[PDB]
Every structure is written in C-alpha cells, then in structure tokens.
C-alpha cells in the first residue's frame, strides 16, 4: 500500500482539482438517452459515455460529437443552427444514416446493434468519416425534428467544439525536466551505493549477520546487492517528483483564480473580469520582454468621432487632436498657455455652435456634449448666412450623411430621445451619427427606405438599392430616390478609390482644394473619407440593374461578376466634399505605455494605419520621446520588379543603421545577443513601413534585421498586413530565445495572438474573435499595467520559490533516510514507521509550500506599480536559475546531516535517554525523534523564505506542525501499530525529545538565516530595498492615494 495508496490519491486529487477549477471558472444540459435503460429517459451532461443511445427534441443543444441513425421525419433529416460555432448563418441539414431508418420506439432501440468504426480527432471543421452528413455539432441547435435517435460516437473533450481551443506551457514548466532528471540521477546514485555496499557487507560471513540471520533474501552477495538496489528505489520514493506536478498544478490554478477574481481589472461596461483562459501560463507573464500591440481597439477607443469636413472647398475644421498638440507644444511655440487656451477657444466654439443648432427647428435627438463635428461656421452657413447655394450645398451634404448608409436605428425613451445608429463598422457609423447631430434624424428602413426629418420636418427617401462596402471595395454606394421624385446615387469611400471614378476634368477648382484639405487632414492624425454623388436616370439605373442582377443570379464566380456589372454605373461620380474621422486615444494608455517601457520591456506597435499618423500618435501615447533619435527603414518604389534593387536597398539601409554602432549581421554578435536581456537603451527607435518589412524579412537579412530590432527601445510597423504581424512575432520569438506578449482585438490579430507565448485579447468593439483565441480576455489596454506588473512578477517569483522549496524538502527527507542506512549495513530498513513515509509528502509538508507559492507577495499591490523597475529581475530570468537549484539542494543535504545526526547523538549514545529508565531508541522511537524536528524545520524553513507572513500561512504552518503530534498520538494508541504502539506518551513525556525538538530546527536553519540576513544587509537586491522603503512609509503615500 505504501506506493499504491499515494498513486491513487494522486489521480483522485487531480480529478478533484480539475473539478474545482471548472467550478470556479464556469460558475448539466438536458439530453434524452437510453444501452440498457429500456427508455429514452432524460440525463445530464455529466452522464456521458461513448456509443450510448440518445434522443434529441426540437431546438435542443447537443452534448458532444454525435452520430444519428434515424428520426421521425422522412429522409432522416435534421436542421442545425450554428451561429455560435460557425460564422455562416444557414440552417445546415444533416441526414440520419440510411440503414437503420426504422428504429422509432422507446425500447425498440436495443436489438439492432450496429458497429461504429469511427476515426480519431478530425479537427478539420469539414472532415469526418469512418464527410459531414453525419456530423452533429455540439453548440448547434437541432431543429425541425420531432426527435432524433441519437447514437453519437464521441464525448468529453474528443469533440472539436472544445478541441479547437493550442495548449501552451510556461517557460520553466519546460526547463523543469533538467531538475527532475537530476533528481532521478541523485536517487540512482544513492541506490547504487546501497547495492554495492550491501552486497559487500553481506559477504563478510563472520559478522553477526552470518550467525543470527539465516541467509539473505536471495542467496548471493551480488544478488543481495540487486534486491537492495530495487528496495532502495522503493524506499527513497519521496525523491519521486510525482507530487511536484500536482503541487504546481494547484499553485498555478489558484494564481489564475486570483487574477480572474481581481476587481481592479473589471471593466464595468462590457461586464467581464480578466478571465484567464490559459491558467498554466501565469508565470510566463512575469518574464515578458516584447509586447506586440495593435492600433485600434487596443491602443485607441475604436469609437470614432466625426472631426472635420470640407465641402465646396469651404472647410469646417474647428477642432484639435492630441497628435498636433504634442507636435506643436514640444517646442517653444504653443507650449503650455496656448495648449490650454486652444481648447478654451474650442469650448467657446462648442457653445456658439450649440446656440446655432438650437436656432433650428426642434430635433429632440440633438443632445449637448454628444456632438463632435463642432463648427459654428457649419451651422451659420446652413441657417442661411454667407451663402445662397453653399447653404444648399450644406443641406444636400447633411442629407447625404443621412442617406448614404445602411445603418439601423434604435431609440431610447424616457429622457429626451437620443437615437443610437448601429451598423457593421464604427467607421461609417460616425458619418450618420453626426448626421443626426445637427438635425436630419434618421429612423428605420421604413418599408420604402429610411425616414429623415430634414430640418426636423419629416420626409421619406425611397432607397432603391445598396452596394455594400467590402475590404476589397474601400467604398460603399447607396442608390436612393430623392424626395423631389428623381433618383440619386451616392458613393462614399477613400481617396485612391473614388478619385479614379470621377468625371475627368470637372470641378477641378473644388477638387484641387478638397484634395489638399485631405492632405492636411491625414497628416494631422485622422483617417478621412470622401463622398461622391451622381444624378441617375430611370432607364440608366435600369440598364445597370439588369446586368447587376443577371450576374448576381449567377451562382458560380459571383464574386468577380458583380465587380464587373456594378462597375458599369460607378465610372461617373462627382464630389460633394471631404470629411475627417478621429478615434480617441484610450483613457489610461499614455500612462500604461510609460509604465511598461519603464519596467524594461520593449513595445512594438504593429499598426495597420498610415505612417505619419502612426509616428505622431506614437509620440502622443508617450511611446516616443525627444531624445529617441528614431531611425527609419524605407525602401522606395520605381525599382521596377527586380529584387536586387529591393534587396540591395534594404541591405545598405540595414548596414548603415548597424554601422551607427558596432557591426552588422555577426553570428558571433548574434550568438552573444541570444543570451542577454539588459533593458534596452532608451535612446533609439525604429519606424518601418509595411513594404520594407516584406523585403527585410527575406531570409538573407532577417539575422541583420533581428540585431537592429534588439537594439532599439520601440518599433513602429506602419501599414502591416495580417501576415507580417505574425511573421515578425515568430521571427523575434524564434530568432532570439525571448518571451513574447501580443495584444489585440478582432479576427485581424488572431495570428498575432496565437504565434506568441502569451496572447491577450481586448474584448474590442470589433468582435469576439480575439477573445476566444486569447489567453486573458482583458477589458481594456490599461489593465496590462495591472496584470503584467502585479500578477506577472508575483506569479513568477512565487513559482520560483515554490519549486526551489519543493526540491529542498524532498532532499532533506530522503537524505535523512539515507544517512540512517549507513547504520543498518545499507540493508534498507525503515527508520520512520512507514505511515510517516506515506504521510510526509501529503499532510505534514505540502500545504505550507503550496501557500507560500500562492499567497506570498514581496512588495504590494500598489508599491509594485509605483516602482515598475522591479519587473526587470524577471526579464533577466533571475528568480529560477541553476545556481539557486544547487544551493537549495546543498541546503537540503546539510540540513539532512544535522537533522538526522542530532536526534541520534541524543538517544543512541546513552544507556536509557528516557529519564525514567525505560527504553527509547527503539528503531521507531528514534524515528519519531527525527521526524518531529524534521517536519518542524521544513516548514520553519519555508517561513524564512516567505516575505509576507499572513494569516493563512502561519495558520497552516501551525496546523501542519501540530498534525504530526496529533496523528502520532492517535495512531499509536491502537495495537494495529504494534511496534509503534505507545510512542506518543513514551516520547512526548521525555525531556530529550523536546530538547532535540528545539535544537534541531535552529541548527538546520542558522546557516540559511545568517546568509539571508547578511545578504539583505550587505548585498541587497532591489526588492529588499523597496521593502525597506515601504517600511519607513515612502510608498505609503502611494498606498494612500490608492485607498483614497
């Protein structure tokens, strides 16, 4: 039982931990089933086996991957909704298998046995055999079916619906093999010493062994040795780390629960705390060096306001952004006083435009502090002033902003009714959101088209058709009947797309100024749009629509037929004006980035936007400075199609940037750079385009590139595609041996999330595609400073200390068994009353270690954010080293020497040692004598190491140290022990027992307490200095601000 009972409680506690983790993560769906229940009784998901009968009613959720054989409706058909699983909406139809379409009853399911030779996990979403005619999904809903004779084929995790969700493992959970293998090495060295020494000491044939002990286990010296070897492998069992992995699993799942339940990372709007979908990676967060971010949904709010617009060459800008704020104020002009009076004048113009808007007819959907196209020039022109036809231009423009869309309307009663305008994109939604901001409020698609209350007085617009935007379009068009009876086409989009589809050579007086207005917009830090209109006729729109439909009715190659036949009306357009869209920088990013870059880690912004907006909004988000002499990598065009131009240009650029210091492409300066992590110099930065990236990521330059991208403090990647985003992560994570974090939202960045070590998904405005593929589903960007800088460095330091102590304690126990073996001729005899040997690694010494690993913290919640630089110690990977492992094992060996030879010198060197005459120093009384001080010194030594002695830890130390006394008092007093029968009263009453109990722990702890104190006084770390500072009360003002 000595090994079988541990090896079953291990799987029991592993199952229980999985269960309680599922509990504290999800915080029993119904399926009708029967192979012997004689009835399709209802059962729950925890009753699932393989190949068991099932019944499934209308719209049921399905339990797992199922096969069916029949149902009520003919053809065996079944419908499924799959919007939760597959992005396509259609009700997908399966057929119940053909042979077996007659089973229809409550007990008639049993006799017709059918063999199911199915195939292993076929993750590929459209593959299964043993096609998809039998594949019933799990999250899908089974419909239009009276019942379903469910005979599935799989269950549990063997369904893709759970399988398609890349198990990663921490960096030290992969470098632990060296430590475990060295443990087995020392175990086999001890066992070989035992074998080769017992075989000798057994071949003496004169000593007291020959006369009184009748032979051996197997008569031979060199076979006695072999049996001793294997029995020693059994007896030094405690040096099997079987209990290391079930301890680390517990400490990791409990740290992950501690970050799931954090309220400082609860974003109140989306209503979602930081749900860690990868609990076994919580310490990886403490070693990050590179962060690969995004530039929409991640760094910015992704809620876009309509900032500027220019129509008929008249611009209504009257607004300011933070990019230009930094740009101008960072020099001597417009620095501070103008930095405030500019927004003062802006607010004055806001009030004046509020006045001008309220001079108009009643539009109740207009609310103060919800208008972002502030322009008293706009409203003064639309009211009637300063233009007869420019007023008409503004009216037509403002109506077009209320027609060109497909946005759907949602009204809020109660307070003055403000309408939200929802559509697929936060880009175009701002256009109609500002359309309703100056009147012209829009209602639903009113059965002929949308309803616009022009200057508050209502009117209808018959929308004929819509050609919707796609990433392959960059524009979207709406053909609508103008209220005066005529029809009118609108097409809104970017600059390079509309400008070709213009009537060549008209309104150049207006076009050559709206284009330069667009230049000023885009350089000012926005993403502008433009609108075109065209007067259509009925017959012209008809001769377009006929071909649009005849190519649309075509089922095959439809994607390239409508681009042809829809282009037959889009060649002719004329501009109505140009616009501008801003997206506010998120609230708390300019501090999170300064904090991260202060911790020492490097920040990469794989932005999909333009380059100059990227540089300016990288200055504005504290990512760049004035001392950061940014160096740029750019290969230009006109290089025909020949790579030698491109490759040579990129090469000379990289070579010059690498001659700006030591040398280029040196695989002796790479073989060296692959082994250092020293806090990048704060003076350099890179700005690389999305074109130069493609050529510098060529296989002959990557090395060179890598070296450059290790020297700089920041790297911008302007206008990258979904490909280079993950390609650069892979290049810098596999080129260097480095850790890596990737933040993002939207399906655009799934590859960035997945190809990195840690993948964090902002629950962004775009979608839940970067949440379901992430590790931590962060509310918004500024929670990174909490996660990475608090839970990251904690969870790393904690596991470092836990595994150090878990090796130390196994050593101190098994080596004190070994030391005894020297006195029993290495013939393996238990000194410890075997039940101690089976309870040690379970009760006496497990809980204190798990607790010092799960609830110990070096500085604080807030002193760790006030001083981020502490994180550097986890970047250099300096908490779990190889010197620490060997120092702790030498500590275990020394404490084993003392903790066996003191309670031996006490009792086995006197006649009686019991003070009332009778005999202790039986073989098991000495076992108790050396097992109580050992369980005291192990726990008292993992207090020396813990930093914050909190309530649970001291309580568990006391419980663990009194449990051995309790269970010896309770186990002895029963004849079932029979040699350890009354050792409780016979050992506790002694005086030598208590003298050894008080002098063994001290003699085994002093050589560590002295080192600890002298070091924390003469060779201090940074953590101990920050601790001695948070003891005065320095960062107590930080905690004070935090509690206030």
């Amino acid at each position: 039982g000595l090994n079988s009972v541990p090896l079953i409680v291990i799987i029991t506690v592993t199952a229980i931990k999985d269960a309680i983790e599922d509990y504290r993560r999800t915080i029993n769906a119904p399926v009708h089933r029967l192979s012997g229940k004689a009835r399709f009784h209802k059962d729950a998901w925890k009753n699932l086996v393989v190949g068991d009968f099932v019944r499934i009613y209308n719209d049921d959720e399905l339990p797992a991957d199922i096969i069916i054989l029949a149902t009520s409706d003919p053809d065996g058909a079944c419908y499924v909704e799959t919007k939760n699983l597959d992005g396509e909406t259609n009700l997908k139809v399966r057929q119940a298998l053909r042979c077996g379409r007659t089973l229809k009853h409550a007990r008639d399911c049993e006799r017709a046995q059918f063999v199911i030779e199915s195939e292993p996990p076929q993750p590929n979403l459209y593959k299964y055999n043993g096609g998809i005619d039998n594949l019933l999904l799990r999250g899908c809903h089974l419909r239009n079916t009276e019942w379903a004779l469910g005979v599935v084929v799989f269950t549990g995790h063997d369904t893709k619906i759970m399988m398609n969700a890349p198990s990663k493992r921490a960096r030290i959970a992969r470098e632990l093999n060296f430590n475990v293998i060295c443990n087995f090495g020392i175990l086999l060295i001890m066992c070989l010493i035992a074998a080769i020494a017992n075989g000798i000491a057994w071949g003496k044939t004169d000593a007291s062994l020959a006369w009184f002990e009748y032979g051996s286990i197997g008569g031979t010296p060199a076979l006695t040795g072999f049996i001793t070897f294997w029995a020693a492998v059994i007896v030094f069992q405690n040096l099997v780390p079987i209990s290391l992995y079930i301890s680390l699993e517990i400490v990791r799942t409990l740290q992950a629960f501690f970050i799931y339940s954090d309220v400082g990372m609860y974003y109140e709007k989306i209503d979602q705390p930081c749900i860690p979908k990868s609990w076994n990676i919580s310490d990886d967060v403490g070693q990050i060096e590179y962060i690969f971010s995004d530039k929409t949904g991640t760094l910015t709010q992704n809620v876009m306001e309509f900032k500027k617009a220019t129509i008929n060459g008249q611009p209504y800008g009257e607004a300011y952004t933070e990019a230009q704020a930094g740009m101008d104020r960072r020099r001597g002009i417009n620095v501070e006083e103008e930095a405030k009076v500019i927004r003062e004048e802006i607010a004055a113009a806001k009030v004046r435009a509020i006045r001008g808007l309220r001079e108009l007819h009643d539009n109740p959907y207009l609310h103060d502090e919800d208008m972002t196209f502030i322009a008293p020039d706009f409203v003064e022109d639309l009211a009637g002033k300063n233009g007869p036809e420019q007023q008409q231009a503004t009216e037509h423009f403002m109506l077009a902003l209320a027609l060109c869309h497909t946005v759907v309307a949602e009204k809020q009663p109660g307070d003055p009714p403000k309408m939200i305008f929802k559509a697929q994109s936060p880009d175009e939604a701002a256009l109609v959101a500002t359309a309703r901001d100056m009147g012209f409020t829009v209602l639903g698609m009113s059965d002929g088209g949308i309803n616009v209350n022009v200057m508050g007085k209502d009117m209808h617009f018959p929308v004929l058709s819509i050609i919707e935007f796609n990433s392959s379009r960059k524009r979207m068009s709406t053909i609508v009947r103008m209220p005066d009876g005529r029809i009118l086409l609108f097409c809104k989009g970017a600059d390079s797309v509309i400008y070709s589809r213009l009537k060549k050579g008209e309104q150049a007086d207006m076009r050559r100024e709206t284009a330069q207005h667009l230049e000023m917009f885009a350089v000012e830090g926005l993403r502008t749009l433009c609108i075109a209109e065209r007067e259509l006729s009925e017959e012209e729109y008809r001769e377009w629509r006929r071909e649009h439909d005849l190519a649309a009715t075509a089922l095959e190659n439809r994607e390239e037929k409508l681009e042809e036949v829809a282009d037959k009306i889009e060649r002719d357009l004329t501009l109505l004006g140009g616009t501008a869209i801003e997206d506010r920088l998120q609230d708390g990013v300019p501090d999170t980035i300064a904090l991260l870059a202060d911790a020492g880690i490097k920040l990469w912004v794989l932005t999909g936007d333009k380059v100059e907006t990227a540089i300016n909004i990288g200055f504005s988000c504290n990512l760049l400075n004035n001392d950061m002499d940014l160096l740029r990598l750019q290969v230009n065009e006109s290089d025909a199609s020949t790579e030698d131009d491109y490759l040579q240009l990129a090469e000379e650029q990289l070579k010059t940037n690498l001659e700006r210091f030591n040398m280029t492409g040196d695989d002796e300066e790479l073989k060296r750079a692959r082994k250092d992590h020293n806090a990048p110099s704060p003076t350099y930065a890179l700005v690389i385009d999305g074109f130069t990236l493609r050529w510098v990521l060529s296989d002959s330059l990557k090395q060179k590139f890598l070296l450059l991208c290790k020297q700089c403090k920041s790297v911008l990647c302007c206008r990258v595609s979904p490909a280079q985003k993950a390609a650069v992560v892979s290049m810098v994570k596999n080129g260097l041996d480095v850790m890596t974090l990737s933040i993002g939202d939207g399906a655009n960045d799934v590859a960035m999330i997945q190809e990195a070590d840690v993948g964090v998904g902002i629950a962004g405005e775009e979608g839940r595609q970067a949440v379901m593929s992430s590790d931590f589903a962060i509310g918004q960007f500024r929670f990174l400073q909490r996660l990475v800088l608090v839970h990251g460095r904690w969870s790393y330091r904690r596991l470092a200390e836990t595994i150090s102590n878990f090796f130390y304690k196994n050593m101190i126990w098994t080596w004190s068994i070994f030391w005894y073996q020297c006195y029993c001729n290495f013939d393996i005899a238990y000194i410890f009353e075997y039940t101690y040997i089976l309870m040690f690694n379970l009760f006496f010494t497990s809980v204190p270690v798990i607790l010092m690993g799960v609830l110990d913290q070096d500085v604080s919640d807030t002193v760790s954010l006030a001083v981020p630089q502490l994180y550097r110690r986890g970047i250099e990977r300096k908490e779990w080293t190889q010197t620490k492992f060997w120092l702790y094992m030498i500590d275990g060996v020394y404490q084993s020497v003392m903790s066996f030879f003191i309670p031996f010198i006490f009792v086995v060197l006197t006649p009686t040692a019991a003070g009332n005459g009778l005999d202790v120093s039986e073989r098991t009384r000495l076992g108790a004598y050396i097992a109580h001080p050992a369980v005291i010194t192990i726990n008292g030594y993992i207090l020396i190491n813990t930093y914050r002695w909190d309530w649970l830890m001291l309580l568990s130390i006391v419980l663990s140290d009194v449990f051995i006394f309790f269970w010896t008092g309770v186990y002895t007093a029963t004849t079932y022990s029979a040699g350890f029968y009354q050792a409780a009263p016979q050992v506790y009453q002694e005086l030598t027992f208590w003298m050894c109990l008080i002098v063994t722990p001290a003699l085994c702890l002093l050589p560590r307490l002295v080192v600890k104190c002298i070091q924390k006084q003469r060779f201090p770390y940074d953590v101990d200095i920050i601790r001695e500072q948070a003891n005065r009360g320095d960062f107590a003002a930080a905690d004070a601000a935090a509690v206030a």
Partner: protein
C-alpha cells in the same frame, strides 16, 4: 442586478492580514539575542544534568580467555569506564578483580553445565535510589529488512495460529522443528531466536570486615523494566504443548522440548523478552536488565556472577554491563549540553558581529536609493 463583478473581500483581492517580515538590524539582533539566550540557558542546564549522573561500565567480552580459572586479578583499564566524582577514594573504580569458572546449573531437572565469570568491582559513592543495570552489545545488528519483520505478533499475543499461516509468514527460515516431527515453533521468528541470554546476579556487597554484615545482596528486580504498555501486546500462550518446540538456538535451555515441567515462557510477565523484541536502532546498543527503586547503593566493592552464554567474540563483537543512575534527561550524555552550547555560542558570536557591524561599522542607511541597480 445581472452584475458580474468579483466579490470584494479580503481574500480574492489578496489583502489578508499580514506581517511584512522585513529584516532590519533591530530585528536581526533581537533574534540572535533571543536564540543565544535560550540556547546558552538550556545548554547550561543540560550539561549540569549530564555531569550529575555517575555510572560504571565494565567490558567482559574476553572473560572466557583472559581470566584465570583459579583466583582473581586485575581487569586492564581498557575495559573499565567510570564516571564518578569521589576523586580517589579507597575504592577507585578502575581496579576490578575478576575470575572465571565452569559450574553446573539446575535448569529444569536436567542440570546443564555453564561457564561463569565473577567480577569484583568498586563503587566509591552512594548511588541514589534509582539504579538501572544495562547490558551493552557492540557490532550486533538488530536492524535488517529481514530481521525486523520476522515475528508473528498475533502469536506472541497468545494464539494457536498453526502451520501454513505461520509457515509462509514473514518468519520464513525458523518456522518448524529442524527435525522430523512436524511441529510449530512457539516464540517463532528470527528475532525471538537470538535473544541475548547471559544471566547476571544481583550485586553482592563483599565483606571488608568493617561492616559486620558479610555479604548483603543488593536485590535488583527484573520486574518493571519494560514499558507497562507492552503487556498489551503479549500474553500467555494457547498451544497444547504437543505442537510447539523451542527455536533452534534455544535448545540448551529446553533440551527436551516444551514439557509440563519445562513449560513455555509466559511472555506477558517476561520483561527480559519484551526488552529484546523492541528492536534497537544501531549496532551498538544498550538494554535494561535489572532495576532498583527503593534503596541507595552504598559505597564498597561488589561482586557479580555473569554466566557467559552469548558468545560474542565469534563475530568480532563486544559485550559489557553498565550500572547507571538516572537524571531527568536520561543517563550520561555529555553531548546535548555541548551541542546546545555550541549553537548558543555561535548565535552569540553572530549577535556580536551583527550588533557591532550594523551599529558601529557602515550602518548602510536603510532603503537608500544607491543599491537599486537602476541608479547606477
């Protein structure tokens, strides 16, 4: 309220009441000033105790060879060891006359002849009313994987467990009569087989002609030398005396088997067997033989008859007998005191070093921002 926030408590947010254990050269010194105090104190107490008791151990492993058969002579002091403080009285517990002899013995109606050793030692101080008498066995391993599990405690308890259930028990070698007759062994095992069986007499105060009483025997009883909780494990047998036999090397005590007039031992009252059956932990060990509780051992020369049955010199071992008086710590162990004093002394040296340095040599201003590795 369909909220989803995690409950703000003192546990989930990691705020539990704590004590930040930050070392300071006013927490270091007030620890190496408490440990040094407690350990020097306890060490002084324990060394005073260990210097209290007084005892004498005489080695006689070679009495059957180096002792003349006729009369007495001196034991070479490489055998005697003595810890008294009479400081050269007229007894000098290093002059122990000793002799050997061979004498017949009436064991049970068959009168086997044994070989005796007479020892005449001196005890110069009046030892105190609790005086134990241990025997000491060097180089005798009772701790072997096969030797410690080899008994049937369900039989020592007193049972008629017969034949196969004992044949295949952990007592594999010694479980039947090493002869024809199919017989159980009653104390069967390998540890009950090897029981040390020299017999000592009660010391006999020899006549110096000054005290009128020639030889008053100092009756030491072998009753109450085991724990009174061990008698909960043993008991009078239950075999019918026709299906048991003494173990192999018990025969010289029971040469005609277990008869009605040489019956098996009653293990419950046998307290020299319950001292053997609780195994030692080292090769060199002591076990209790005789105890005295109600009288002091007056000074003078005593004499002991030790029948030497356990031949120990055949495996290069040694054996001896020791007369100890007790303290509350145990018997004389000079080592607990010195260990406590060494730990206390090094705590005192480290306390001096810390108070001195961290107060007189470079206090290293607390929490100062010059060792922070980023201010350099």
């Amino acid at each position: 309220a369909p909220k989803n926030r995690p409950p703000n408590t003192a546990f989930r947010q990691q705020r539990m009441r704590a004590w930040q254990c930050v070392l300071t050269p006013k927490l270091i010194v007030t620890v190496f000033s408490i440990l040094a105090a407690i350990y020097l104190g306890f060490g002084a107490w324990l060394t005073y105790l260990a210097h209290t008791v007084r005892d004498l151990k005489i080695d006689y492993t070679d009495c059957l060879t180096s002792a003349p058969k006729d009369d007495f002579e001196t034991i070479p002091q490489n055998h005697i060891t003595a810890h008294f403080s009479a400081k050269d009285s007229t007894f000098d517990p290093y002059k122990a006359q000793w002799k050997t002899t061979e004498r017949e013995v009436q064991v049970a109606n068959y009168t086997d002849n044994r070989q005796f050793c007479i020892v005449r030692f001196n005890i110069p101080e009046d030892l105190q009313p609790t005086i134990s008498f241990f025997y000491y066995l060097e180089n005798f391993y009772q701790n072997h994987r096969r030797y410690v599990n080899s008994f049937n405690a369900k039989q020592l308890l007193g049972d008629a467990v017969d034949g196969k259930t004992i044949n295949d028990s952990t007592c594999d070698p010694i479980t039947h009569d090493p002869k024809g007759t199919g017989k159980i062994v009653y104390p069967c095992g390998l540890v009950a087989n090897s029981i040390f069986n020299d017999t000592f007499s009660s010391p006999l105060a020899l006549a110096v002609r000054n005290s009128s009483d020639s030889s008053r025997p100092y009756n030491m009883t072998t009753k109450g030398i085991a724990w009174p909780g061990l008698k909960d494990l043993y008991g009078k047998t239950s075999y019918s005396l026709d299906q048991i036999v003494p173990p192999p090397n018990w025969e010289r005590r029971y040469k005609y088997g277990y008869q009605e007039n040489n019956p098996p031992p009653d293990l419950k009252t046998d307290e020299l067997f319950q001292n053997w059956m609780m195994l030692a932990a080292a090769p060199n060990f002591y076990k209790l033989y005789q105890k005295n509780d109600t009288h002091p051992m007056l000074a003078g020369q005593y004499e002991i008859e030790i029948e030497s049955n356990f031949d120990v010199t055949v495996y290069k071992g040694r054996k001896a007998f020791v007369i100890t008086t007790l303290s509350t710590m145990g018997s004389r162990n000079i080592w607990p005191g010195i260990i406590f004093l060494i730990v206390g002394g090094i705590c005192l040296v480290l306390d001096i070093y810390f108070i001195l340095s961290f107060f007189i040599w470079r206090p290293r201003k607390l929490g100062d921002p010059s060792y922070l590795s980023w201010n350099q």
